[PDB]
């Protein structure tokens, strides 16, 4: 009598895949002041459960919510397979995984000495991945000189921006990059990254599966969780 899930589903191994996917957005002053910041999250569930279960999801200050039609500390018969359990958005007490610290210095009207420092700010137990930093260059840029201790950088002069790429970097660390911009006689610094944790601080408390028509209880379900945070707009002024 449920239009989103058939009857007579049986899995040998009743498994549960729970992906928490957040996008952290941040607009910072060069001086570290959070000008605007928020997280947009969804909770995707892959569900391999037998029959017609009644499940309860439960997990900090959420602002919006947008559940699936099945939802009613929320109970629901989840469909079979992948579906998005809920969307959400938070704005307070967000973990900002990186601190971008620009520093520019003029040299006459010919040179531009630029130095940019990124600070990771999370358990050093954990690695950030796919780290990319864009430093835009002015339009009247003749050439660019740049060196950097970690990772690689290149002056994508078509895009009129420096792109610095870093494979990994653990938390509570710091790396920098220095550049000389010769020019011909101020958008922000962007970052992208992936972190193995929900920046909002969200963590999943319990997921309970109740099947009273079939021969399994909650002790029987195998339950798995994954947290992944990525950047959206992640810019620093200067």
């Amino acid at each position: 009598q449920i239009g989103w899930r058939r009857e007579g589903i049986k899995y040998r191994r009743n498994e549960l895949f729970l992906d928490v996917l957040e996008s952290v957005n941040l607009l910072m002053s060069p001086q570290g002041q959070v000008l605007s910041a928020h997280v947009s999250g969804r909770v995707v569930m892959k569900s391999y459960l037998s029959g017609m279960p009644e499940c309860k999801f439960g997990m900090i200050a959420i602002d919006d919510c947008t559940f699936h039609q099945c939802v009613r500390s929320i109970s629901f018969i989840p469909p079979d397979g992948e579906f998005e359990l809920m969307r959400y958005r938070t704005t307070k007490d967000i973990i900002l995984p990186f601190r971008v610290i620009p520093l520019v210095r003029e040299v006459g009207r010919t040179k531009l000495e630029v130095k940019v420092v990124i600070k990771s700010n999370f358990k050093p137990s954990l690695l950030a991945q796919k780290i990319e930093v864009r430093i835009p260059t002015p339009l009247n840029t003749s050439g660019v000189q740049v060196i950097c201790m970690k990772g690689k950088a290149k002056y994508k002069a078509s895009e009129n921006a420096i792109v610095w790429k870093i494979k990994r970097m653990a938390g509570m660390k710091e790396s920098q990059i220095s550049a000389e911009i010769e020019l011909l006689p101020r958008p922000p610094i962007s970052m992208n990254f992936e972190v193995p944790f929900a920046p909002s601080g969200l963590k999943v408390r319990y997921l309970k599966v109740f099947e009273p028509k079939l021969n399994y209880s909650d002790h029987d379900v195998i339950k798995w969780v994954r947290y992944i945070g990525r950047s959206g707009i992640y810019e620093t002024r200067c």
Binding site: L16, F17, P196, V204, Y206, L207, K223, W224, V225, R226
Partner: peptide, 7 residues
């Protein structure tokens, strides 16, 4: 890649 257990 990595799913961790929930408990």
């Amino acid at each position: 890649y990595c799913y961790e257990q929930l408990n």
